[PDB]
Design a protein around this nucleic acid. Structure first.
Ligand SMILES: [Mg+2]
Ligand SMILES: [Mg+2]
Ligand SMILES: [Mg+2]
Lengths: 42, 29, 149
RNA sequence: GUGCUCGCUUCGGCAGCACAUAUACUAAAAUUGGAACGAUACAGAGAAGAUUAGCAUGGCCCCUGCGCAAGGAUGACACAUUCGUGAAGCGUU
């Protein structure tokens, strides 16, 4: 029922937070956290 | 001779980092 | 225009390359070249110039500041972000990089990001002033608990 | 292609078998665009006032040279008065 990202049975396209629904081809290289900790800025 | 005015002498496309450079383009003179 | 402008660019461009090849370093040549292409809004060329200059002398802090600055002036936020990260990674001791990096993130609004940066920075156990700046950063928001910590 | 089947069997043909096993930038062509250190033309050798000897240094410059030798113009290339903005950080009244 929700119709927004906020909120299988639904039988709707729903994308719940931010999974992209249109092509972007974005450059960004995935930020990563390892095990417990850190954004792997190295 | 054309290593200058035709074709970018040697090109290093910048490396791409955690952000989106796809969209960016720039204006003419 | 169409051709007349073009010839001008060859004379300048070629001259810049000649200067660089003659002296190799003397990064005022590198920088001036970068600046000229920036002014013509040929910023992809500019990027390559800056990277080439970095290959010659990666330790030169004016060079890095000019590079990051150029990206910011052209609203290329993510390029600038990359560059800042590199600068602090390779030359961690340079405080100018850290101060600018946090400032940029603050301006962009990314408080979390800035906090993260400062936490990285503090790992280097820097200087009294750096710690003060981190604390003051926190105190521009209420965040008194953070400050005390 | 050569030989052999007391092959069919005449000397013609046909059959079987054995042996013998993969050449070649295929062109005798067609097209396509960098160099002669030719003449001509313009101009005309580094260093200091000039005239000159030279070793070098550097490499998106070569050439001669068997050369890690030596030459090529040293091969060429190498062009004293007097301050204040703007932003940020830190400490203080
Ligand atoms: Mg002489
Ligand atoms: Mg000699
Ligand atoms: Mg010489």
């Amino acid at each position: 029922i929700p119709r927004l990202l906020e909120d299988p049975e639904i039988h709707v396209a729903q994308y719940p937070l931010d999974m992209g629904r249109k092509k972007k081809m974005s450059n960004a290289l995935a930020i990563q956290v390892d095990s417990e900790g850190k954004i792997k800025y190295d | 001779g054309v290593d200058y005015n035709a074709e970018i002498p040697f090109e290093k496309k910048p490396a791409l980092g955690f952000y989106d450079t796809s969209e960016e383009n720039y204006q003419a003179l | 225009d169409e051709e007349e402008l073009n010839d001008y660019k060859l004379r300048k461009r070629k001259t810049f390359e000649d200067n660089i090849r003659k002296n190799r370093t003397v990064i005022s040549n590198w920088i001036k070249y970068a600046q000229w292409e920036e002014s013509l809004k040929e910023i992809q060329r500019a990027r390559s110039i800056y990277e080439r200059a970095l290959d010659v002398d990666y330790r030169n802090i004016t060079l890095w500041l000019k590079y990051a600055e150029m990206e910011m002036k052209n609203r290329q936020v993510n390029h600038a972000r990359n560059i800042w990260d590199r600068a602090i990674t390779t030359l961690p001791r340079v405080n100018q990089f850290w101060y600018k990096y946090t400032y940029m993130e603050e301006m962009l609004g990314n408080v979390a990001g800035a906090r993260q940066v400062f936490e990285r920075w503090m790992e280097w156990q820097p200087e009294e002033q750096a710690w003060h700046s981190y604390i003051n950063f926190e105190l521009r928001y209420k965040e008194v608990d953070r400050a005390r910590t």
